[model samples]
Target: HHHHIEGRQYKDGYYITTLNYNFNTVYNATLQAIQNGQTFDYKSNPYDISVNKNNGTDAEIVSASDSDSTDSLQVAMKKLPNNATRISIKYGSQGNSIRSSALIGIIEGNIRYANT
Candidate 1:
C-alpha cells in the first residue's frame, strides 16, 4: 500500500516509519523515499534495503552490511517542518531471481508523527 500523512502538527519531536514484510521465500525488501506534499522535500532511506536470500548469501549479506532488517524494516524521520502538508512512504521487495517460485503473505506497519 502507498499512502500519505497529513494535517498533524510536528509536535517538535522525532518520528518513525516502520515497514514489515512476511515471506517464507524470496528476498530483498526496500524502504523507499518520504515525499513531502508541500515543500516537495523528499529522500530515500539511508539503510535502503534488506537482502536475505536465505541461501549461502544470507550470511555474506548480513556480515558485509551496515543496515538492520529481516522480514521487517524500520526508518526514523525528523520532525515535520511547517511547510509539509503531506508525506508519502512506500515499500517494495525483490525475488531471489532463480529459486523464488510462487509465494504469499502480508506487509504491515505504520507512520508515527507524534503521541503514543
Candidate 2:
C-alpha cells in the first residue's frame, strides 16, 4: 500500500529530461517539478516520459497535471501507473529559440513502505 502526491510547476521555463531509476521490486512511481516555466513556446506535450517496467511487460508510463494552456504548461502525476521502471522525457515545442530547452529538476524523491 502506498500514498503519494506528485506535483510539477512551470513558472520560469518548461522542462524536458530523461531519468534513470533502478528499482528492485514492482512499485508505483511519479515525478514532479514544482516551480517556474510558464514562459515557454512548446505546444505539443513538451514533457513526455516513458517507463520500462520490472516485469515482462514494459508498461508505458503516463502523466497528469493541473497546469496546461497556451501561456504555460504546469503538470502533476497522480497514481498513473502501478509499476514503473526506466523513464525518458521529451520537452514540447513552444520555446523561443531552438536552444531553449525545458529545465526540470526533482523537487521530490522515492520512499519505501512496509505492508502488514
Candidate 3:
C-alpha cells in the first residue's frame, strides 16, 4: 500500500491534487471507503460513483455533495503502468473554500486509511 502525492494546485476555483498509488489497492480501497460512507469529512454519502473501462484500462469517477452545504467533491482516476494509479481530486468553488478544502483532506485520509 504505497502512495504519493505528486502535486497539488488551485485552478479555476478548483483545488486539484494529483496522487499516485498502487492501482488495485487504491482503487478497491476507494470504492470501499465510498460504500462505507467514509470518504467525506462528515456523514454524507457519495451521490454518484461509476467505472469506465477501455482498451484494457479502467477509470473511476466519483462525485458527492456536502450534506450541510452546496460544496461538492469530484475524483477522477486512471490506471497507469507498473501497478500504479493516477488520481485527480477536485473540490471547492467560490465561497466554499473552507469546506471544500476540508472535503479533500478527509477524502484523501480515508483513501490512505482504507489502503492500509
Candidate 4:
C-alpha cells in the first residue's frame, strides 16, 4: 500500500492537497462554518483529530480516520521545517502528476499538480 500526493484549489480559501483517500471533513467543515457563522480551528496528532470553536477555544476531537488502504488515504500533515512559506513534504507513494507552473502568494514562479 502506497500513498500518492496531490494538490488542488477547490476555489478561493478552499485549497486542498489530498492522497488516494476520500475527504469529507473539509467539505463538512465548509458547511458547518457557514451554518454557525463562525470559523473553526483544527489540530491533529497520533491519537486524534480535533476541531476547535475558535482559536484556543472549545477544542474537541470531532472524529478520527487513521486507517490506511492500498488505493486510498484521507490526510496527514506535518509542520514545515523552516517557516510558513516553505513546506518540505516527502512521502513515498505513486501516481504523481506534478506539472510545473507558477507559484502562489508572495512567491514567484510556477507549481503544477493535478488540476481538478
Candidate 5:
C-alpha cells in the first residue's frame, strides 16, 4: 500500500506523473482496469486502448484515449529492482485540472486495489 507520485508539466502542454508500484500486480491491473472502463471514478465512455511492447525501452506501454476528448493517457511501466515498477503517466493538454486529478486517482486506486 505504499507508492510515490511526482507530477510536473511537460513540454507541449502535457501533464505527467511518475509513480511507483508493485511491478507484477499493478502492471496487469492497469491494463485490465482500463479495458474494463473502471478507471474513471464516474461513468465514462469507453476508451481506445492500445499496447506496445516494442518501444525500445524494456517497458510495457499502454495508451488510452476517448473519441470525445482531446486529452489522452499514456502509461509506461518499466520493471525495477525489488519487485517494483516505475509507472510514468502522461496525459492532457494542461487545461483540465479536475480530469487530471481524477485520472491520477484512478491510477493510485488501481495500484492499491491490485495490492489488496
Candidate 6:
C-alpha cells in the first residue's frame, strides 16, 4: 500500500493570502510559519462516517447503504481533507450507534484492526 501522508498544517495563525495582500513581504509569511513549525495548535479532525440518530449520538457503521440514512449517521465532524479520500479509523464503530449491530464490526475484528 502507498504511504498515507497525514494532514499537515501550521496553526500559529497565518495571513490568508487571498485575503491578506502581503505582496511586498518578500515572501508568504504563512510558508515561513509552517516551515518553522511555529503553530500553536493543530489536530487532524478526520472525517468520521458513523451511523445512528441525527441528534448526534449513538454513531455506528452501516452497510454500503449507510449513504441513505438522514440521521443514521449519528455523530458530526468538520474540516476533513477532501484530498485525503481514504478515511482512516478503527475497524470498529465510533461508539455512536444506538447499539451493537452488524454494521459495527469493531469489537469483533482483531485487536489491532480496531484502528482502521
Question: What would the TM-scores of all predictions be?
Answer: 0.16, 0.26, 0.52, 0.19, 0.57, 0.17
lDDT computed for candidate 4: 0.25
The residue pairs that clash in candidate 5, if any, are none
Which candidate comes out best when scored by lDDT? 5
Per-residue alpha-carbon lDDT of candidate 3 for residues 1-104, written as tens digits (9 for 90 to 100): 45544566555665544445566555556565555655553455654444433333555554555454444455556677776555555553442445545645
User: Who wins the TM-score comparison?
Assistant: 5
Give the per-residue lDDT digits (tens) of candidate 5, residues 10-113. Answer: 44544455556656565566666666776542237545666655332245644545553554656666666666555555554443444555665676787776
Report the Cα lDDT for residue 48, model 6.
32
Error of 3 at 7 (Å): 2.3
Which runs in model 1 stand beyond 4 Å of their true positions? 1-69, 83-115
Q: For each candidate, what is the lDDT?
A: 0.21, 0.30, 0.53, 0.25, 0.55, 0.23
lDDT of 1 by residue, 36-85 (tens): 11111113233323342333222111111133232222222222233221
lDDT for 86 in candidate 1 is: 20
Show the colliding residue pairs in model 4. 21-73, 99-112, 101-110, 101-111, 102-109, 102-110, 103-109, 103-110
The sequence of per-residue lDDT tens digits that candidate 4 reaches over residues 23-114 is 22223332342233231112222222344232221122222324432221122222222221211111113421221011121112111121
Root-mean-square deviation (CA) per prediction: 17.5, 12.7, 6.2, 14.8, 6.0, 20.3
Better of 1 and 5 by TM-score: 5
Candidate with better lDDT, 1 vs 3: 3
Candidate 2 segments exceeding 4 Å error: 1-27, 31-56, 64-85, 94-108, 112-116
TM-score of model 6 (CA atoms): 0.17
User: Candidate 3 at residue 86, lDDT?
Assistant: 59
For residues 3-109, could you state the per-residue lDDT of candidate 6 as single tens digits? 43444221222111111111212122222222332221113122233332222211122221122322222211111232111211222223322222321222223
What candidate 6 gets wrong by more than 4 Å, as runs, is: 1-20, 24-27, 40-116
